[PDB]
Design a binder for this molecule. Structure first.
Ligand SMILES: CCCCCCCCCCCCCCC(O)O[C@H](COC(O)CCCCC)COP(=O)(O)OC[C@H](O)COP(=O)(O)OC[C@@H](COC(O)CCCCCCCCCCCC)O[C@H](O)CCCCCCCCCCCCCC
Ligand SMILES: *Cc1cc2c(cc1C)nc1c(=O)[nH]c(=O)nc-1n2C[C@H](O)[C@H](O)[C@H](O)COP(=O)(O)OP(=O)(O)OC[C@H]1O[C@@H](n2cnc3c(N)ncnc32)[C@H](O)[C@@H]1O
Ligand SMILES: C/C=C/CC/C=C/CC/C=C/CCCCCCC(=O)OC[C@H](COP(=O)(O)OCCN)OC(=O)CCCCCCC/C=C/C/C=C/CCC
Ligand code: HEM
Ligand SMILES: CCCCCC(C)c1cc([N+](=O)[O-])cc([N+](=O)[O-])c1O
Ligand SMILES: O=C([O-])CC(=O)C(=O)O
Ligand code: SF4
Ligand code: F3S
Ligand code: FES
Ligand SMILES: [Ca+2]
Ligand SMILES: [Ca+2]
Lengths: 238, 113, 588, 129
């Protein structure tokens, strides 16, 4: 059928303030397509419309966008889920972050917090393994749901606490990642890591709102991981 | 360690809030259970309920718990919305003084009954 | 002199699997280095890798690197260098275990329904190996590897220029590569990155087809920059079409399925792969297993439906548990794209474009080579290549499964470990006149002043179509012939193509356009090559020449650029090594 | 734009543009309820003050509570307070572990909470009367 789209537009050198632009992409009513598909077509009609995209299969994290008020990946959000007769399909950039152009936001602050938590293994080197490290399936199982994060930023972009303290509160993604190392048998700085997170913002700004779990493409659960971090903190600081 | 935050650190704040929450929930139940077992409240019944060592001591433990709890609480809120330093400090000052006065007035009211 | 300059002792163009493994190694060596990328590093195609990394570790069962050489040489069709392969397979373990010490989320061994063994990287059964030597961490081995690697560049504080578009390389008066030029996608500014070493790691470009497993990013910018500069490309017709791509989707599904015990069946219920490769079964080589299913479609005996003429990749028989534990990434891409839960129904799979075996010819040390007047290998000063953009001649004419990732790390690291030595060798390289630098800015200037030209979409669309039909799994002279000409037509067409967006703040169009040129030069070389070869080898299958020419075509077809001037085609080869190795019969 | 330095990028932050789960509503009300209750205590202390000062005082308080306008306010205070306790307890439970941290488990907690709140709110109204 026909499709009425509502898309966020902005260009520092032409516009001085954002505006929502009307789009009509008459598509074949054959089957369902992803929102990325639409955009790519619309961009043929209109070149100026810019947005990020790549793996195209829900695995790179590039196409994070707020669709009809909810964050998700354009590469895997079916037009079915977003089509309602008479009403338009509102597509906007991820909330809170600064807008570089059209639907492209500066992800800077996002990556920052990620680094703050030391996203890499830390092994004092004491007791070197002959070959690889000793990791029993049961120990490795603990990483599941903590290493598949794609840094799409749908989560952090949906959290009010992160809107207010972009640089103080680490945010869902960053905490999920912190936990990934806190419970890695291979990592030997877990107590050092916990001391680094004991301030008032890093971790405790999380109010268990659960919007992060709500929108995670990979179905990850940062709230739960943050809850475990908090527990470690109590074990170590009380 | 943030100067306005009661807690020395995060975890400290986490605990203080949860401990006072608990103490305050008991107290509330205590006060509720009384009113739901009163019906028509006479001046004799009212003052009788407070002239009680137990009620005095609980009421003051509550107020004191409120200072700690509402302090950490209002603090977290101000940290989110009042970004201009000068303004926020004024508020915290107004708030903490208020909380302290709540407790002081509590003592004054209690020994006076 | 109005163009900005950024001097580095190195410039690694590409943040893919190999691009980062190198940037990391080059940095460990106390060398100043800038790492560039079109997207955020964690977004490179590598993140999408599934299967795993095939290296002889001996975990799953005792093994030696030589079996890895035999399994592989026969896999390439004795078109892949014994010197290079040897080095890769041998240096395999150490290099991989290196990654585990970096924190790579490998799967582990010990208890399983009917299995049991210690903490080793879990090695899965895979295509082209007698037994299971594929180190895999769930279905997402690439995502694991890429991310670990990025976390590493974070630790060692590597200088990263994210979302910068490299245009064309800059040549020295003496004909050396001395850096490159690039576009800051964010702001739009153009800059010349001057370097004593310029490493290309721009991955493949399967985007020259209509149905590929690659990402919208794989436009072989690398290939285009090498040709437009004067650097050749080896075996640029050798393209591996993956056996189990999703019908109608073009989205990949791991070979590990067959590895965990997956069936590749036909509508008549038979396992045609058992009949094609009578003893090797579904484990049969890449090139081979493709034509099998593709053939069942030629005879009108291929399964059909909404998705299209597919083959059934039955897995449901395996436990829903095993599928969720071992292939979680598969159970979702199927549902999401194929609308079929593998736990209960087979998957609409079809051979689709996958790995590009061809690319810039290089020594094990990652250095780039061109032929001499006589036709002798001559290294190119200031230029190196690693990853998929490079034909070190390891996969030859058929890339064994899970070896590409093994390639990335090994030669990626090989390039780094050897950089300082290589610079010493080429010695000093002189500056570039604004002329040299100005030259590279040509492609860019063109697009920006031309606005009344032709709409790129069509040119792009056509480009892909032609390649799809004339250079598919099976091809023939008459075909290439036609396409080879259509291409010329299009290549001229593309010269008048226009650019609608002339903005600065993140111009997706400008970038896609500039990538088109590469799509063009890439597809082109691909063709002139495909046509040229008179034999049916690995992925190359001509109905006109059904057998492999051992005496005539046992060599690397070198595409001979002259930038945009008129082309040429030559040859190359590598039989010597340490333990020795003979050509033979190739029955999978 | 500071003095002689321009352009500050825009931000998507129109709340009417963002769709908020029930769980997000649940917690923000907990925050609001808290600030209401902060103020509430003062008011209640004042009343308690009058109430106990003397007989004439207890009379003056009994009558203030007579105003139906006042009855409405004394009613919200207790409802706000009630909301806050319930959601607070819900909060503390997930913390420890008497509630799943899954999203579904989360919406269920939230819903049951509002229900108990409404009920207590009704009871509060019966008392104010
Ligand atoms: C598990 C979690 C626990 C929940 C926690 C949540 C708590 C908040 C929710 C509040 C719920 C309250 C529920 C009350 C209740 O149950 O009412 C009951 C109703 O039960 C039914 O309807 C039966 C149905 C059964 C179905 C199964 C009993 O009500 P009655 O029938 O007696 O009705 C009054 C009557 O008309 C007859 O009324 P009256 O004529 O006697 O009234 C007189 C009127 C005026 O008297 C005065 O002037 C004295 C005022 C004294 C005020 C003292 C304030 C104390 C402040 C302390 C602060 C300490 C820091 O009296 C008023 O109407 C009485 C108002 C009482 C308000 C009490 C508020 C509780 C405050 C607790 C402390 C707060 C802490 C803040 C940090
Ligand atoms: C597509 C695919 C491939 C794949 C696989 C699954 C899929 C869906 N599973 C594999 C597996 O299990 N085992 C294996 O051995 N290989 C597997 N493959 C193939 C493999 O992923 C590739 O060979 C490999 O990823 C290539 O890595 P490389 O690092 O060489 O390339 P890349 O990851 O594609 O990244 C290229 C980088 O270069 C940047 N770039 C490109 N052009 C430019 C310009 N002009 N300027 C600046 N940077 C540029 C990219 O942005 C990217 O960072
Ligand atoms: C006065 C009457 C109001 C009572 C409402 C009680 C909540 C009922 C409920 O479960 O709503 C769920 C709904 C979502 O359902 P859904 O999640 O779309 O679907 C779930 C169906 N259970 O929730 C809402 O629409 C928001 C309800 C907010 C209630 C606030 C409590 C305040 C009390 C003051 C008095
Ligand atoms: C004396 C009456 C009370 C007042 C004035 C009060 C005030 C506050 C304030 C201002 C906050 C912080 C707002 C926020 O950041 O969300 C808060 C949070 C909280 N309160 Fe209370 N409170 C009171 C009673 C209670 C009681 C009785 C409980 C126990 C059920 C409780 C449990 C909690 C919890 C768990 C939080 C944490 C919310 C978060 O971290 O987001 N409160 N309170
Ligand atoms: C009067 C309250 C206004 C709240 C506005 C916004 C955007 C908000 C929304 C949620 N939420 O959970 O949906 C949480 C917080 N908050 O400060 O915790 C928050 O500030
Ligand atoms: O390219 C390969 O190595 C095969 C692969 O990833 C897969 O089958 O998933
Ligand atoms: S946890 Fe989920 S939503 Fe959050 S950044 Fe990672 S993939 Fe994105
Ligand atoms: S939404 Fe934000 S407040 Fe916590 S529960 Fe998720 S990180
Ligand atoms: S394009 Fe990568 S997940 Fe959407
Ligand atoms: Ca530890
Ligand atoms: Ca290659």
């Amino acid at each position: 059928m026909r499709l009425e789209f509502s898309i966020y537009r902005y260009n520092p050198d032409v516009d001085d303030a954002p505006r929502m632009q009307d789009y009509t992409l008459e598509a074949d009513e054959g089957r369902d397509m992803m929102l990325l598909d639409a955009l790519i077509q619309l961009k043929e009609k209109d070149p100026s419309l810019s947005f990020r995209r790549s793996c195209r299969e829900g695995v790179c994290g590039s196409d994070g966008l707020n669709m009809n008020g909810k964050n998700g990946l354009a590469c895997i959000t079916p037009i079915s889920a977003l089509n309602q007769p008479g009403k338009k399909i509102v597509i906007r950039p991820l909330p809170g972050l600064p807008v570089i152009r059209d639907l492209v936001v500066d992800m800077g602050q996002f990556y920052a917090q990620y680094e703050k938590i030391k996203p890499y293994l830390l092994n004092n080197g004491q007791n070197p393994p002959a070959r690889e490290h000793l990791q029993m399936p049961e120990q490795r199982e603990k990483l599941d749901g903590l290493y598949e994060c794609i840094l799409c930023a749908c989560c952090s972009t949906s959290c009010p606490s992160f809107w207010w303290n972009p640089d103080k509160f680490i945010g869902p993604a960053g905490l999920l990642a912190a936990y990934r190392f806190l419970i890695d048998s291979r990592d030997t700085e877990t107590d050092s890591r916990l001391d680094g997170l004991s301030d008032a913002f890093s971790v405790f700004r999380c109010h268990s709102i659960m919007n992060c779990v709500s929108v995670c493409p990979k179905g990850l659960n940062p709230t739960r991981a943050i809850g475990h971090i908090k527990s470690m903190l109590l074990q170590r600081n009380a | 360690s943030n100067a306005s935050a009661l807690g020395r650190n995060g975890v400290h704040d986490f605990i203080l809030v949860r401990a006072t929450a608990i103490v305050l929930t008991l107290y509330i139940i205590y006060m509720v259970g009384f009113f739901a077992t009163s019906g028509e409240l006479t001046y004799e019944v009212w003052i009788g309920f407070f002239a009680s060592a137990f009620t005095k001591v609980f009421t003051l433990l509550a107020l004191f718990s409120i200072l700690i709890h509402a302090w950490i609480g209002m603090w977290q809120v101000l940290t989110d919305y009042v970004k201009p330093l000068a303004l926020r400090l004024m508020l915290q000052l107004v708030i903490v003084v208020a909380l302290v006065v709540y407790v002081i007035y509590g003592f004054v009211v209690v020994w006076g009954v | 002199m109005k163009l900005p300059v950024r001097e580095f002792d190195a410039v690694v163009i590409g943040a893919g699997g190999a691009g980062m493994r190198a940037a990391l190694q080059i940095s460990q060596s106390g060398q100043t280095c800038a790492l560039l990328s079109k997207v955020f590093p964690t977004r490179s195609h590598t993140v999408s890798a599934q299967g795993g990394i095939t290296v002889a570790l001996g975990n799953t069962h005792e093994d030696n690197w030589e079996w890895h050489m035999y399994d592989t040489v026969k896999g390439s069709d004795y078109i892949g260098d014994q010197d290079a392969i040897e080095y890769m397979c041998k240096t395999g373990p150490e290099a991989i275990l290196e990654l585990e010490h970096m924190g790579l989320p490998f799967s582990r061994l010990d208890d399983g329904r009917i299995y049991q063994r210690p903490f080793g990287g879990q090695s899965k059964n895979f295509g082209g190996e007698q037994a299971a030597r594929t180190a895999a961490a769930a279905d997402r081995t690439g995502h694991a590897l890429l991310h670990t690697l990025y976390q590493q560049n974070l630790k060692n504080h590597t200088t990263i220029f994210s979302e910068w578009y490299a245009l064309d390389l800059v040549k020295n008066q003496d004909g050396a590569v001395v850096g490159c030029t690039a576009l800051c996608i964010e702001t739009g500014e153009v800059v010349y990155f001057k370097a004593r070493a310029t490493v290309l790691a721009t991955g493949g470009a399967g985007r020259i087809y209509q149905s590929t497993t690659n990402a919208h990013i794989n436009t072989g910018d690398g290939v285009g920059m090498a040709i437009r500069a004067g650097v050749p490309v080896q075996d640029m017709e050798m393209w591996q079409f993956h056996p189990t791509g999703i019908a109608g989707a073009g989205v990949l599904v791991t070979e590990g399925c067959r590895g965990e015990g997956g069936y590749l069946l036909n509508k008549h219920g038979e396992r045609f792969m058992e009949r094609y490769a009578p003893n090797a079964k579904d484990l049969a080589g890449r090139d081979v297993v493709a034509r099998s299913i593709m053939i069942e479609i030629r005879e009108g005996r291929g399964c059909d439906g909404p998705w299209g003429p597919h083959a059934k990749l039955k897995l449901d028989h395996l436990g829903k548990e095993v599928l969720e534990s071992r292939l979680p990434g598969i159970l979702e891409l199927s549902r999401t794209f194929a609308h079929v839960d593998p736990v209960k129904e087979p998957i609409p799979v079809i051979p689709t474009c996958h790995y590009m075996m061809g690319g810039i010819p290089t020594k094990v040390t990652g250095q780039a080579l061109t032929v001499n007047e006589k036709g002798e290998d001559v290294v190119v000063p200031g230029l190196f290549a690693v990853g998929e953009i490079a034909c070190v001649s390891v996969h030859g004419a058929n890339r064994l499964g899970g070896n590409s990732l093994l390639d990335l790390v090994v030669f990626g690291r090989a390039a780094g470990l050897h950089l300082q030595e290589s610079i010493a060798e080429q010695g000093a390289l002189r500056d570039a006149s604004e002329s040299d630098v100005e030259a590279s800015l040509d492609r860019l200037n063109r697009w920006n002043n031309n606005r009344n030209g032709e709409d790129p979409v069509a040119i792009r669309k056509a480009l892909q179509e032609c390649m799809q039909h004339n250079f598919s799994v099976f091809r023939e002279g008459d075909a290439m012939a036609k396409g080879l000409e259509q291409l010329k037509v299009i290549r001229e067409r593309l010269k008048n193509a226009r650019l609608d967006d002339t903005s600065s703040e993140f111009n997706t169009q400008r970038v896609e356009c500039l990538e088109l040129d590469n799509l063009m030069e890439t597809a082109y070389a691909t063709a002139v090559s495909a046509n040229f070869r008179t034999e049916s080898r690995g992925a190359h299958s001509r109905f006109d020449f059904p057998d492999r020419d051992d005496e005539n075509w046992l060599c690397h077809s070198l595409y001979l650029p002259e930038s945009e001037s008129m082309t040429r085609r030559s040859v190359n080869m590598e039989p010597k090594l340490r333990p020795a190795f003979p050509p033979k019969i190739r029955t999978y | 734009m500071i003095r002689n330095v321009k352009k500050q990028r825009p931000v998507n932050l129109d709340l009417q543009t963002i769709r908020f789960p029930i769980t997000a509503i649940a917690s923000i009300l907990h925050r609001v309820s808290g600030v209401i209750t902060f103020v509430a205590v003062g008011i209640l202390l004042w009343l308690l003050g009058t109430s106990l000062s003397s007989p004439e005082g207890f009379e003056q308080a009994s009558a203030i509570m007579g105003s139906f306008f006042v009855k409405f306010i004394m009613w919200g205070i207790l409802t706000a307070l009630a909301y806050h306790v319930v959601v607070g307890i819900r909060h503390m439970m997930m913390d420890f572990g008497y509630l799943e941290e899954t999203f579904e488990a989360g919406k269920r907690s939230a819903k049951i909470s509002f229900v108990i709140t409404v009920v207590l709110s009704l009871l509060a109204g019966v008392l104010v009367w």
